[PDB]
Design an enzyme around this catalytic site. Structure first.
Site, PDB file in Angstrom:
ATOM      1  N   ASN A  10       2.373 123.154 -44.310  1.00  0.00           N
ATOM      2  CA  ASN A  10       2.216 122.444 -43.301  1.00  0.00           C
ATOM      3  C   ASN A  10       0.566 122.699 -42.792  1.00  0.00           C
ATOM      4  O   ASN A  10       0.511 123.793 -42.056  1.00  0.00           O
ATOM      5  CB  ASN A  10       2.858 122.983 -41.962  1.00  0.00           C
ATOM      6  CG  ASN A  10       2.653 121.975 -40.789  1.00  0.00           C
ATOM      7  OD1 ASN A  10       1.761 121.273 -40.866  1.00  0.00           O
ATOM      8  ND2 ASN A  10       3.395 122.119 -39.702  1.00  0.00           N
ATOM      9  N   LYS A  12      -1.250 121.245 -40.447  1.00  0.00           N
ATOM     10  CA  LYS A  12      -1.539 121.083 -39.202  1.00  0.00           C
ATOM     11  C   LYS A  12      -2.871 120.140 -39.212  1.00  0.00           C
ATOM     12  O   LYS A  12      -2.944 119.234 -39.906  1.00  0.00           O
ATOM     13  CB  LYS A  12      -1.982 122.395 -38.434  1.00  0.00           C
ATOM     14  CG  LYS A  12      -0.528 122.689 -37.694  1.00  0.00           C
ATOM     15  CD  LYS A  12      -0.201 123.762 -37.978  1.00  0.00           C
ATOM     16  CE  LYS A  12       0.998 124.472 -37.465  1.00  0.00           C
ATOM     17  NZ  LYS A  12       0.995 125.946 -37.264  1.00  0.00           N
ATOM     18  N   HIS A  94       8.804 119.909 -34.782  1.00  0.00           N
ATOM     19  CA  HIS A  94       7.729 120.883 -34.790  1.00  0.00           C
ATOM     20  C   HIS A  94       7.628 121.635 -33.428  1.00  0.00           C
ATOM     21  O   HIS A  94       7.368 120.798 -32.424  1.00  0.00           O
ATOM     22  CB  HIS A  94       6.573 121.048 -35.493  1.00  0.00           C
ATOM     23  CG  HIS A  94       5.581 121.979 -35.730  1.00  0.00           C
ATOM     24  ND1 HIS A  94       4.882 122.905 -35.164  1.00  0.00           N
ATOM     25  CD2 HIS A  94       5.932 122.851 -37.133  1.00  0.00           C
ATOM     26  CE1 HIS A  94       4.280 123.835 -35.969  1.00  0.00           C
ATOM     27  NE2 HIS A  94       5.348 123.728 -36.938  1.00  0.00           N
ATOM     28  N   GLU A  96       4.861 122.757 -31.918  1.00  0.00           N
ATOM     29  CA  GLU A  96       3.737 122.299 -31.253  1.00  0.00           C
ATOM     30  C   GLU A  96       3.929 121.079 -30.723  1.00  0.00           C
ATOM     31  O   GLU A  96       3.481 120.904 -29.772  1.00  0.00           O
ATOM     32  CB  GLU A  96       2.505 122.414 -32.254  1.00  0.00           C
ATOM     33  CG  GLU A  96       2.280 123.734 -32.781  1.00  0.00           C
ATOM     34  CD  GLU A  96       1.748 123.869 -34.102  1.00  0.00           C
ATOM     35  OE1 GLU A  96       1.368 122.929 -34.876  1.00  0.00           O
ATOM     36  OE2 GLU A  96       1.567 125.036 -34.262  1.00  0.00           O
ATOM     37  N   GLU A 164      11.809 128.509 -36.736  1.00  0.00           N
ATOM     38  CA  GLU A 164      10.498 128.969 -36.397  1.00  0.00           C
ATOM     39  C   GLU A 164      10.686 129.881 -35.269  1.00  0.00           C
ATOM     40  O   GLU A 164      10.743 129.405 -34.117  1.00  0.00           O
ATOM     41  CB  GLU A 164       9.505 128.144 -35.947  1.00  0.00           C
ATOM     42  CG  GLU A 164       9.553 126.485 -36.388  1.00  0.00           C
ATOM     43  CD  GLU A 164       8.521 125.750 -35.702  1.00  0.00           C
ATOM     44  OE1 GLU A 164       7.348 125.813 -35.499  1.00  0.00           O
ATOM     45  OE2 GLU A 164       9.277 124.637 -35.173  1.00  0.00           O
ATOM     46  N   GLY A 170       2.298 133.466 -32.678  1.00  0.00           N
ATOM     47  CA  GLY A 170       1.081 133.935 -31.801  1.00  0.00           C
ATOM     48  C   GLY A 170       1.065 134.779 -30.746  1.00  0.00           C
ATOM     49  O   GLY A 170       1.306 134.301 -29.555  1.00  0.00           O
ATOM     50  N   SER A 210       5.474 133.832 -39.469  1.00  0.00           N
ATOM     51  CA  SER A 210       3.958 133.833 -40.211  1.00  0.00           C
ATOM     52  C   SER A 210       4.155 134.232 -41.607  1.00  0.00           C
ATOM     53  O   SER A 210       4.324 135.606 -41.659  1.00  0.00           O
ATOM     54  CB  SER A 210       3.058 134.565 -39.390  1.00  0.00           C
ATOM     55  OG  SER A 210       2.675 134.134 -38.011  1.00  0.00           O
TER      56      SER A 210
END
Lengths: 247, 247
Positions: A10, A12, A94, A96, A164, A170, A210
């Site tokens: 991915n 991004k 996703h 985001e 995920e 983060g 991650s």
């Protein structure tokens, strides 16, 4: 069936044609095992360029699409566009988009059904937030997510589930093989119980927290993780390392 | 000095290589006034191919982009990427993004500054809905819509304002030329009132309503009308007719 290791890159919103082709070159050139199914998801301006440059060995995924083939949708591309170009996968749901672009579970569900009808494989994403995780509500969420999806699939064979832990990447942490193994195990059990064990056993549930070159073995090693949705690390030669993880 | 006639064609989520190629074809080979300034807004997946095949005289615009160069924004595109395929414009704040996707006043504004900040030409979109038009809150809406852009523009030379009579889209309503003019003339007064007589003077206001070979000349004749942002007719050869309207 005896489920094949899957690894997704991915990208991004990263790269340009120079930088990327370098990537691809390095890829195209690398030694990777089948056992492992690989797919790269490029920014849309890059999709064609990439299908063009990438070897047949490697699949190409769009990082998002809409649920209609044509129209008054400024800024959106269609499953048919995707296909047109030779990509065969679309990454959907996703984090985001869920979170920064506010995509709904409904809206995602419709993208899944449309993408499927149009014959593109899908890697669909679920995951809970730190606060979701911390409230002790992980299951409820991830399950809600997942059914929204499930209610829209007809054919689990062009489908990959990417778990995920948003909650994590983060903000420091873990996404310790063990906490990851757990969700993977319950999802699969969910599916089993809300779909069929047939489906349960055919579907690849990939880990999407991650992942790295250091990491991967440990994750791969686990019982219910069938691969990874890879981010940051998908942009460096380390990806080859990840691809050839289980090994 | 005089303001250069602008004709932006917005393809929306329409086209394939084959059909787009076909049109690039009709476009490339027509004789278009040098007096007019034309740009085509292709779907992200086709920007490079567009760029590659459109005649250099013709400009290429992305139909959307994100506030950043790079990042963890699955499914986004950056101006930087636009610039890479060689495109020079970006369409920002288009009523579909605004109402189908929820893009806000502030987001759009953030977008604008970033786009300018990087060298693109920005085609900003403003327009009121029927509920608004109706309630007589027109100026109110488009002035707060403009205001938000304006506060993020430092050099108006790379900016085109596009008015979209949303109240006249699928509403069952038909906007008149006079309606167009009026709003346009009101947009220009706002600009000399809040920015500078100069900016007012220099800045193009194109009409984003429905345009065809058939309404195109009256429209162009309107005094505050400096071109258009063409929808439907941009996928057809009448598009050449619309480009060579104003003499």
């Amino acid at each position: 069936a005896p489920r094949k290791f899957f690894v997704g890159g991915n990208w991004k919103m990263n790269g340009d044609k120079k930088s990327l082709g370098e990537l691809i070159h390095t890829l195209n050139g690398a030694k990777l095992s089948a056992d492992t199914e690989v797919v790269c998801g490029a920014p849309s301006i890059y999709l064609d360029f990439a299908r063009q440059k990438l070897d047949a060995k490697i699949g190409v995924a769009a990082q998002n699409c809409y649920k209609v083939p044509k129209g008054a949708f400024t800024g959106e591309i269609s499953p048919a566009m995707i296909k047109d170009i030779g990509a065969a996968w679309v990454i959907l749901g996703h984090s985001e988009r869920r979170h920064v672009f506010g995509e709904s579970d409904e809206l995602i569900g419709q993208k899944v059904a449309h993408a499927l009808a149009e014959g593109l494989g899908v890697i669909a994403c679920i995951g809970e937030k730190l606060d979701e995780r911390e409230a002790g509500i992980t299951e409820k969420v991830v399950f809600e997510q997942t059914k929204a999806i499930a209610d829209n699939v007809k054919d689990w064979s062009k489908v990959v589930l990417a778990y995920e832990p948003v909650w994590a990447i983060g903000t420091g942490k873990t996404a310790t093989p063990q906490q990851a193994q757990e969700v993977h195990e319950k999802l699969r059990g969910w599916l089993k119980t809300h779909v069929s064990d047939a489906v349960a056993q055919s579907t690849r549930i990939i880990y999407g927290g991650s992942v790295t070159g250091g990491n991967c073995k440990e994750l791969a090693s686990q019982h219910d993780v069938d691969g990874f949705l890879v981010g940051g690390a998908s942009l460096k030669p380390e990806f080859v390392d990840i691809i050839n993880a289980k090994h």
